Amino acid sequence: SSNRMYMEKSQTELGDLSDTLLSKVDDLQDVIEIMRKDVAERRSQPAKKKLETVSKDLENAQADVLKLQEFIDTEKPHWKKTWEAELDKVCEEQQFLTLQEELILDLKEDLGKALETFDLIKLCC
């Protein structure tokens, strides 16, 4: 597996993990708002079985949150090193082009002066 392929697969994995958790949190928020609205305005209580399942869904989301943070924490340092490698290489290649462009201008100048000098020499002869 290349550095580039590892980057793209691991970032895709990150996106899938946070996406799955986002949808679980969205679902939890909906269920809990139904509960809050009923208690607040009607003093009507949720079913006991629902309190139980929400309790466990909250516990599961807490666990997933920790795993998501661990994924970011473990992968991030390697991602930065991968980017640094690619960016440093591009920078050096752009600087090379720039240096080569200045060099050819210097060569044309130097060759032009050599020609003129050689022409003077031939005239003198």
Whether 8 and 79 have beta carbons less than 8 Å apart is answered as: no
**Token pair for 9:** 């697969």
| Interacting residues with a copy of itself between 9 and 48 (CB under 8 A) | 11, 14-15, 18, 21-22, 25, 28-29, 32, 35-36, 39, 43, 45-46
Q: Give every CB contact of residue 54 below 8 A, 6+ residues apart in sequence.
A: 28, 31, 32, 35, 46
- Residue with tokens 């509960």, as numbered in its chain: 35
- Shortest spacing between CB 51 and a copy of itself, in angstroms: 7
* 86 lies in the site for a copy of itself, by CB under 8 A: yes
Whether 46 and 31 have beta carbons less than 8 Å apart is answered as: no
Give the helix/strand (H/E) hosting 45: none
- The only residue of 3, 9, 74, 76 in contact with a copy of itself, by rule CB under 8 A: 76
Residues constituting the chain? 125
Chain residues in the site for a copy of itself (CB under 8 A): 7, 11, 14-15, 18, 21-22, 25, 28-29, 32, 35-36, 39, 43, 45-46, 51, 54-55, 58, 61-62, 65, 68-69, 72, 76, 79, 83, 86-87, 90, 93-94, 96-97, 100-101, 103-104, 107-108, 110-111, 114-115, 117-118, 120-122, 124-125
